[PDB]
Amino acid sequence: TKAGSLTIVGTGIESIGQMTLQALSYIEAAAKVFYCVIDPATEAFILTKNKNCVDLYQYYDNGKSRLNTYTQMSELMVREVRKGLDVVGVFAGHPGVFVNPSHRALAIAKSEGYRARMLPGVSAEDCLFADLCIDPSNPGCLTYEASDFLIRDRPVSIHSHLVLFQVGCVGIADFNFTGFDNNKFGVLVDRLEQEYGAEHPVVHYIAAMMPHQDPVTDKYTVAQLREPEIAKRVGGVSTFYIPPKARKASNLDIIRRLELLPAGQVPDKKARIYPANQWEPDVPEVEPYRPSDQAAIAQLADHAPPEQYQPLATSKAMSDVMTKLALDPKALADYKADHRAFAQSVPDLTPQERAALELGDSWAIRCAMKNMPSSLLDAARESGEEASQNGFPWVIVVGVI
Amino acid sequence: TKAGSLTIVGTGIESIGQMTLQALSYIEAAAKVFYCVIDPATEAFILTKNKNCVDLYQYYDNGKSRLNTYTQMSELMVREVRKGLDVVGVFAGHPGVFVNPSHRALAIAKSEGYRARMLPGVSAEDCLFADLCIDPSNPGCLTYEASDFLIRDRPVSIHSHLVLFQVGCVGIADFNFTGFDNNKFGVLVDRLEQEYGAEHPVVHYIAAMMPHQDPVTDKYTVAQLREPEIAKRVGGVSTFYIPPKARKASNLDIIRRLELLPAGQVPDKKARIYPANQWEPDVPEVEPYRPSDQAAIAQLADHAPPEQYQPLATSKAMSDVMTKLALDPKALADYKADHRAFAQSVPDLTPQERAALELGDSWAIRCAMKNMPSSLLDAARESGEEASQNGFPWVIVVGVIGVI
Ligand SMILES: C[S@@+](CC[C@H](N)C(=O)[O-])C[C@H]1O[C@@H](n2cnc3c(N)ncnc32)[C@H](O)[C@@H]1O
Ligand SMILES: C[S@@+](CC[C@H](N)C(=O)[O-])C[C@H]1O[C@@H](n2cnc3c(N)ncnc32)[C@H](O)[C@@H]1O
């Protein structure tokens, strides 16, 4: 309903490959691209994909306040939005994770009535989970900016994951082309010593930024971070992962109210699902092949799909259109403008496929692309009111479930 | 050296478009693909990219324990790894975020001496930050699985973001094709009432799973979650976001030790950097264009890049090879095996480009791809240290920083 749009997208952390297909598609479709990325291969890639790019990094300077820079970056984007253009902003990682100017620009554009969207990307924390072989679900995850962690005295949980961004320049972090002096690093180490003890592990993590490099996953004690040669390794792309120090016990009241007792008691609080977190101090070895695991594996020989399983049964024409809607922003905009008129223009759809697309309905799309068996709908009819998507994947964190 | 590998990748949350370029490239290059995705368009897309796919979802069944299913899913992948094949596992979102079988399979493969890697993807939490317009950095973020949150009595912080996954089946969540019965949801609501009060907002979040659908971003009070017509909207793809109830003050000792002085007038604890979190209750309106913002904008007219700014200055041949290494897993494997032989096979590189690639050094690559000015290297050489990457982007969360 008004000309002009702002879409902010991420590149991910590792050069080129961690960009999403949709982020690429918006970069190619844009009238104007504004980017801020440290990696030159990623910068070069972006410039091959759009003819009208501006490097936002040129608005930093020595002794020029970051906030003034962020104001300038956002204003450069919003000015093009105001002139009626489809503008794309590009930042490293996930563009809304530990980033100032993306949020500012989107809020401004939205407040003046323009279309404004952030697209998610792969963050440094996403990379951390992948490279350290941890899951934030087990046993929960606290994530802070290191200076904020200190200044606001943010609480830690010794029973959960802790991730600290921006450990490489605690306190004042004035822009400087020839680098930070992390002269207040000891204030962070002090806090870590108070919370965890001098012998507790801290993992220095740096995701590889090129496809070929290995990640830095260096474990140190809190005490070792005081050594000058170790402290010097922590720079502007360093993140700290602090593993839990202990395992939290279960709450008897909740166990009862959730009916997890079979007139009997749960797994011991250290009776872990394989694999254990390898960074956790004094982590005991967990057996991957218990008798129950071996029995489950034995059943694979006799396995067939359950009668309620819904095999995919689609067509080239339908997969092509669903792919086009995900990868062509213009096609998506058109479809959202008028489901019918779009659905009518698509070649080679069956009547069901056309109808489902026209209708705007997840269930219709599912039926069009999956063979739904009688035993599923008979069970969905005999119990309840109407059928929908069910049978969800689900992480088990507590041993009982 | 040992034959066989396992790479586990994500699809992201929204159909197709949230898969990474590298996830796609590994799916295409794999000898065998094992996938577990709910979205049929994503399943169809995967099947068009590799000829040898297996749907892991078929190993679920009614009243069959999920742990047994996960054991089976892992074992199917690891069997093909032990046979010396390049195997790819595909799960929704980020394949290591709230997922059991990926971690099991990788840990087994790795313990038996096979190459094993997880590639990150876009999670439902990444989607949540983007759709709710929040930054986990401001003012920190706590993330839990809902049943674990309750059973282990995990702490909340009323001053930070809280994100809860799997709110649609609190407690026993046995597999059922016709869906969960969320009859213990009240146990979660009681906990939220105790921690936050009955009138505090909870945001029911469901990311759009078709490119065209819109996100669900519905704000309710904790009390409203007890209404049957509201509680029934919560399902298997629901996540809750609970915004902070208050702003935390600064610590005077830390202010001093970090030298964020003088006078005793740091920014007030509610003096926010624009924009404010719109979900936070009684959030005061923040001014986007303060006098200093207007002055910064006035300087745009006379702006030129500083002396130390490094323009990109590369070639078609160099951007091509760097792109190939990011997008072609075979090409990358060759390059890592022998930098020199790979770099000498590459057509049309200049001597420096060739040389930088032979070395495998971030800094050599940067010099080959950017024009480094004298002002920058004269500053590095005056220090007595070789130049490296500096001038990092940095989020400002504490308002005192940025005022200095
Ligand atoms: C201003 S933030 C930007 C984060 C980015 N938007 C993201 O999605 O992660 C900079 C901080 O992110 C983290 N970071 C950036 N690159 C990284 C890397 N290669 N490895 C580990 N952490 C990184 C560090 O904590 C760094 O100080
Ligand atoms: C087994 S987990 C898997 C998460 C996935 N690996 C990821 O990266 O987010 C399932 C939970 O993820 C969250 N989730 C999955 N799809 C979602 C969506 N479309 N919107 C919001 N949350 C979602 C919900 O909390 C759901 O209960």
Residue numbers in the entry:
A (entry chain A): 7 to 407
B (entry chain B): 7 to 410
From the paper:
Omphalotin A derives from the C terminus of the OphA protein, and it is the OphA protein that methylates its own C terminus using S-adenosyl methionine (SAM). The structure of OphA reveals a complex catenane-like arrangement in which the peptide substrate is clamped with its amide nitrogen aligned for nucleophilic attack on the methyl group of SAM. Here, we report the structure of the peptide amide methyltransferase OphA including complexes with cofactor [SAM and S-adenosyl homocysteine (SAH)], cofactor analog, substrate, and product.
Y76F, R72A, R72K, and Y98A were unmethylated even after 3 days of overexpression in E. coli. During prolonged (12 days) incubation, there was some evidence for a very small amount of methylation in the Y98A mutant (>100-fold reduced in vitro activity), but not in the Y76F mutant. We speculate that the flipped conformation of the substrate (seen in R72A, Y98A, and Y76F SAM complex structures) resembles an intermediate arrangement that occurs during translocation.
